[PDB]
From a paper:
Although the ligand-free cryoEM structures of HPM7 spike reveal a 3 RBD-down conformation, our data suggest that the antibody is capable of shifting the equilibrium by capturing RBD in the up conformation. Although modeling suggests that CC6.33 should be able to bind an up RBD, we did not observe this in our dataset, possibly because of the HPM7 spike design preferentially displaying 3 down-RBDs.
Mutations in the ACE2 receptor binding site on the surface S protein have been shown to disrupt antibody binding and prevent viral neutralization. In each complex, we used a stabilized, uncleaved Spike trimer (HPM7) based on the Wuhan strain containing 6 proline (hexaproline or HP) mutations (Hsieh et al., 2020) and an engineered interprotomer disulfide (mut7 or M7) between residues 705 and 883 of the S2 subunit.
Residue numbers in the entry:
A (entry chain A): 937 to 1034
B (entry chain C): 297 to 618, 632 to 676, 689 to 690
C (entry chain A): 14 to 247, 254 to 296
D (entry chain A), G (entry chain B): 740 to 788
E (entry chain B): 838 to 887
F (entry chain A): 543 to 618, 632 to 676, 689 to 690
H (entry chain B): 986 to 1034
I (entry chain A): 346 to 394
């Protein structure tokens, strides 16, 4: 049955897929300008002097920190779901197996 | 010490701390520009016998030259110089692509209209910049060149128009303007007007009425092959080393390698998924080079309490020791699936775990400890 | 000087399906193995394309049609043609298309390519033409009309000379040429591509991306344009159309998802506004 | 690396937010430790093999 | 058309919809849930835990 | 209206402004009413776009037919992209393009409010 | 509609970092699916009527 | 345009932050509901069946 | 006549069309600066006091 039903293990495959997506999202989000003239620090630094560059860079820093904070929050929520599943599994090990 | 700074403490508890990433500093710099030898036509642009009327301004293409504007320091004086594109101090570090010089004569009070976002006779009917403008505006007093005693009436401007201009348009039509209900077939009087007026430039005019010569340099930056570059000397190209670089004005740090990418004839730069440059076409030899960051990562430190011992072991997660992007060795090099662990003694006895490392490996501080 | 052509049959316009064409590389940046979202003006997918043609069929009730109308330029134009004999030569872009305003003339005259911006006074039926000499079997340029006058000429470019093949070739259309024309902040932007074809009716279904050709620093207002065709000669009635067809569509702001292959070629695209799927 | 990868000028600005970065890592570390704990709680019920 | 009729009412549901906020229906209706509940009760009374 | 721009549907209003008031405001502080500058009447302003659309798709690796559900449309000029055929009113919205079968089955693609869909038979 | 309803100019600016909208919608969809799942687990335990 | 863009971007950032806050709160609340639903399902099997 | 700066003159303007383009045929201003609006938007607006 397991061999012939690929969807059977979707619960474990889903964990893997969700984590991969969360990291791929963080990389893709680097391309956002966040109000800046450019998403590339090297472009900002090549064309602007320090006091002008600082403004554009600070816009990018704020946006980038926001992306990381979003990531961490999502991971904490997912961690809680997994903890609950793990606690259930531990209970079953004692009550069903032992 | 990095761990101590991170924790804001002079004491570190037993355990494993992450300590940033293994990083590589650049040791050499690379500067590459197309090997352009001509000086830009500063004389033709700024020392012209005559400038165009503002209603019919001139436009000239500039290419295959070096923008060494220090040549103007001995003889030119500009009352106005303002860059919208880049900071003025960066002009000599950059390359420019589609570079054009717009040129005309206006009155001194009208100089303030040659800017994005302005209104007025010039801004609305004669010459307009886009709100999104990359370039520099240059202007200077020409009273001793353009004004004449009886009045220089050669310079014209548009006074009447039915609608506003779009950026960079030249309307040179002389059709009669209809201000009233009259069809103005000819007529040239009453409510019908000849649209262009002259400026009576005289040596006795007050400053706001003196002529000014205006040059606008319009250009794009860092997204296409250069035709004009600043006065910067190139260097040799250094591969497979961590270097600083400047390719046609685009700066960065990384390791350059040969690429198998094939750029289309008009492409100068390539970008990755995060829109970061990861390839360039070298400007002197048209070879595509790929760029990889110098730094990579994976460093953590295994620490016994510091109130007991100052020995630490360092784990390099992505290093396969079996000088490998390692800070130091000193023997005690143990390869595990969790990385290359350096400073710990490997023993073959199994023990209950104390400080976990990963992949089945755990450490402790034990015996001459 | 100018000739008002006659004998032309009056027919209704034809329409065709744009399918999935009119995509061009929107940048000067190399990308590969990625998808990318862009918001520029594009020909919408499966849009209404007006089909124009030049044809001479037979005597009695022959079609005898030669389409060279003035069309709106709107926000930019997708232009494409299918031909075998170099009939379509160029275009006129402008507003009034007379001596009162500046107009842009881009023409291949079988010697060179000439681009001018002048206060041109155009003919109502501008055309070029080739005379066929039965003696020594030659096809040679014999006529040029287009305009009766030109004046201030604020922009000019002339290409290096070449020989263009003027033969009255028979068969299926063999050459598909596509162009995109835009007028932005004073620049007349042209994108293009040349595709080999073998067909007898409307635009083939398929996909390709056009490359940037040129950014012309023109500075004029364009609201209308006209296509310039060449005639074949054996006054206003003494002409044979030859066979060619051209398609005109208009660009609209759209969002597209573009797909780049492993070598950086755009190989596919999604028109995000076409339907809910 | 995520925000100011290999950029001295960006890094020096980023320092203003250094306490923010520390908290992001503390949260991730707490998760990481927990994940090994979860595995041990489910499987290592009996320490007699 | 109902939200135009309700402008005077200042119905919060329309305000939410106009600002892009919506509510999705459940897959199982109240009637379907009632049927499951009734089946469980019928089963319990008839056969207990079997 | 006197320099205040926007997009929307203008209808007659039952609001009565004090003599010195020109514009009205909603809870979101958006404009929701104006006094007309020439005819002294008050108009209410409602956004043109109302929303509620989702698409039911069999995999694209099978076919490209889709059905579209309009959550706030009652099909009993419908604010739909196309009337098409096979117009089925459900409590979850007006569904256009799916056939209505009175034979119940196991749920495949859930739609809502007791309705599901699947792809089957010339499918 | 929430951020930039009915406005072309801010829409084009919003697209600059619109990848954030997609992420928000995914999170809400995940909840929506879960809520029907919860109903079925509590009530549809017996598939015999 | 250029002045409006600055003012608009300030509003967009704030509007986006509000939506992110909403989603986070819904995810946390959803977890609490999930736990309740799991308990209810447990009771259905152990108290009713 | 213009007022002395210490005793500046304030005039009320009402019930008229602000077609400032009429000044193009005669006046020349060395200084022109708007603080509350962009100059290019002036022709689409109505003003009160
Ligand atoms: C570009 O050309 C068009 C066509 O001549 C100009 O539009 C006309 O403007 C006049 C004066 O306002 C109106 O009476 C006509 O009805 C308009 N015609 C059309 C077709 O719109 C347009 O103003 C020109 N562009 C510029 C920047 O001057
Ligand atoms: C203009 O000509 C004078 C000589 O009359 C020369 O000294 C000056 O450098 C020239 N300026 C430029 C830009 O060539
Ligand atoms: C000069 O440019 C040509 C063409 O790009 C290149 O082949 C040559 O090596 C360059 N040379 C120098 C600086 O000697
Ligand atoms: C290191 O490389 C060798 C191949 O040279 C490989 O067999 C070994 O497994 C690698 N070490 C680790 C920890 O993966
Ligand atoms: C073409 O016809 C128009 C009238 O429609 C006339 O004004 C023009 O002069 C004619 N041109 C020639 C070359 O006969
Ligand atoms: C436009 O395309 C439609 C098909 O979508 C066709 O029925 C119609 O005849 C075409 N031409 C015009 C002028 O509408
Ligand atoms: C093409 O135009 C060029 C430039 O005006 C001219 O010298 C040449 O003779 C023309 N050729 C023909 C066939 O008209
Ligand atoms: C063919 O002959 C005609 C005269 O009959 C002459 O005008 C023409 O130039 C000749 N063609 C060529 C290619 O020599
Ligand atoms: C355009 O040509 C006419 C020819 O009569 C001339 O009077 C006018 O000054 C020219 N305009 C420009 C800008 O050269
Ligand atoms: C890329 O070019 C190579 C030849 O250099 C060719 O073999 C390969 O198929 C091309 N890749 C794609 C995706 O077309
Ligand atoms: C002028 O304004 C008054 C309101 O003050 C209005 O009643 C009248 O109809 C308007 N009329 C015109 C343009 O005739
Ligand atoms: C649609 O309108 C009809 C009245 O024409 C009403 O009976 C029906 O309940 C409405 N449908 C829904 C789903 O509310």
């Amino acid at each position: 049955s397991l061999s012939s039903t690929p969807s059977a293990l979707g619960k474990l495959q889903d964990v893997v897929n969700q984590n991969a997506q969360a990291l791929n999202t963080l990389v893709k989000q680097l391309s956002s300008n966040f109000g800046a003239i450019s998403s590339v620090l090297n472009d900002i630094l090549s064309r602007l002097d320090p006091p002008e560059a600082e403004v554009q860079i600070d816009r990018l820093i704020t946006g980038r920190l926001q992306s990381l904070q979003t990531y961490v929050t999502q991971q904490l929520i997912r961690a809680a779901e997994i903890r609950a599943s793990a606690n259930l599994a531990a209970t079953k090990m004692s009550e069903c197996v032992l | 010490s990095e761990t101590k700074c991170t924790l804001k403490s002079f004491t570190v508890e037993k355990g494993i701390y992450q300590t940033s990433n293994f990083r590589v500093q650049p040791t050499e710099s690379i500067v590459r520009f197309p090997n352009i030898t001509n000086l830009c036509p500063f004389g033709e642009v700024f020392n012209a016998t005559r400038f165009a009327s503002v209603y019919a301004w001139n436009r000239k293409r500039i290419s295959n030259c070096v923008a060494d504007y220090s040549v103007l320091y001995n003889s030119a004086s500009f009352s106005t110089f303002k860059c919208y594109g880049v900071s003025p101090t960066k002009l000599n570090d950059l390359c420019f692509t589609n570079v054009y010089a717009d040129s005309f004569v206006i009155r001194g009070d009208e100089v303030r209209q040659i800017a994005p976002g302005q209104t007025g006779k010039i801004a609305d009917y004669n010459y307009k910049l886009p709100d999104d403008f990359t370039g520099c505006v240059i202007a200077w007093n020409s009273n001793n060149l353009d004004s004449k005693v009886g009045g220089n009436y050669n310079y014209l401007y548009r006074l009447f128009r039915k609608s506003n201009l779009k950026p960079f348009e030249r309307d040179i039509s002389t059709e009669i303007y209809q201000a009233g209900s009259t069809p103005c077939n000819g007529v040239e009087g009453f409510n019908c007007y000849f649209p262009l007026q002259s400026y009576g430039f005289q040596p006795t005019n007050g400053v706001g009425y003196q002529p000014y010569r205006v040059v606008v340099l319009s250009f794009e930056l860092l997204h296409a092959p250069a035709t004009v570059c600043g006065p910067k000397k190139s260097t040799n190209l250094v591969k497979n080393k961590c270097v600083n670089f400047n390719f046609n004005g685009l700066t960065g740090t990384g390791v350059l390698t040969e690429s198998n990418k094939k750029f289309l004839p008009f492409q100068q730069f390539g970008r990755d998924i995060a829109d970061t440059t990861d390839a360039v076409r070298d400007p002197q030899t048209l070879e595509i080079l790929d760029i990889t960051p110098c730094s990579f990562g994976g460093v953590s430190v295994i620490t016994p309490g510091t109130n007991t011992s100052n020995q630490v072991a360092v784990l390099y997660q992505d290093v396969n020791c079996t000088t490998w992007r390692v800070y130091s060795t000193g023997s005690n090099v143990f390869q595990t699936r969790a990385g290359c662990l350096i400073g710990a003694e490997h023993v073959n006895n199994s023990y209950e775990c104390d400080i976990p490392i990963g992949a089945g490996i755990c450490a402790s501080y034990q015996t001459s400890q | 000087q100018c000739v008002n052509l006659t004998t032309r049959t009056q027919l209704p316009p034809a329409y065709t399906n744009s399918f999935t064409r009119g995509v061009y590389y929107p940048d000067k940046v190399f990308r590969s193995s990625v998808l990318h979202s862009t918001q520029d003006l594009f020909l919408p997918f499966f849009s209404n394309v007006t089909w124009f043609h030049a044809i001479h069929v037979s005597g009695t009730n022959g079609t005898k049609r030669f389409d060279n109308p003035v069309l709106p330029f709107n926000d930019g134009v997708y232009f494409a043609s299918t031909e075998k004999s170099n009939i379509i030569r160029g275009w006129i872009f402008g507003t009034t298309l007379d001596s009162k305003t500046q107009s842009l003339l881009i023409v291949n005259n079988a010697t060179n390519v000439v681009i001018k911006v002048c206060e041109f006074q155009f003919c109502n039926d501008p055309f070029l033409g080739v005379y066929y000499h039965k003696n020594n079997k030659s096809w040679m340029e014999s006529e040029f009309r287009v305009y009766s006058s030109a004046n201030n000429c604020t922009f000019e470019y002339v290409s290096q000379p070449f020989l263009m093949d003027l033969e009255g070739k028979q068969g299926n259309f063999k050459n598909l040429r596509e162009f995109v024309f835009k007028n932005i902040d004073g620049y007349f932007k042209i994108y293009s591509k040349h595709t080999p074809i073998n067909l007898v009716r409307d635009l083939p279904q398929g996909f390709s991306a056009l490359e940037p050709l040129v950014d012309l620093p023109i500075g004029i207002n364009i609201t209308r344009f006209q296509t310039l065709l060449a005639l074949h000669r054996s006054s206003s009635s003494g002409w044979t159309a030859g066979a060619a067809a051209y398609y005109v569509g208009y660009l609209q702001p759209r969002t597209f998802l573009l797909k780049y292959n492993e070598n950086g070629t755009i190989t596919d695209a999604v028109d995000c506004a076409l339907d809910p799927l | 690396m995520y925000i100011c990868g290999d950029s001295t000028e960006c890094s020096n600005l980023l320092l203003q937010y250094g306490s923010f970065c520390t908290q992001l890592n503390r949260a991730l570390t707490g998760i990481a430790v927990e994940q090994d704990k979860n595995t041990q709680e489910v499987f290592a019920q009996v320490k007699q093999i | 058309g109902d939200c135009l009729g309700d402008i005077a009412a200042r119905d919060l549901i329309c305000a939410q919809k106009f600002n892009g906020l919506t509510v999705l229906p459940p897959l199982l209706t109240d009637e379907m849930i009632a049927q499951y509940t009734s089946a469980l009760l019928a089963g319990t009374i008839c056969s207990g835990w079997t």
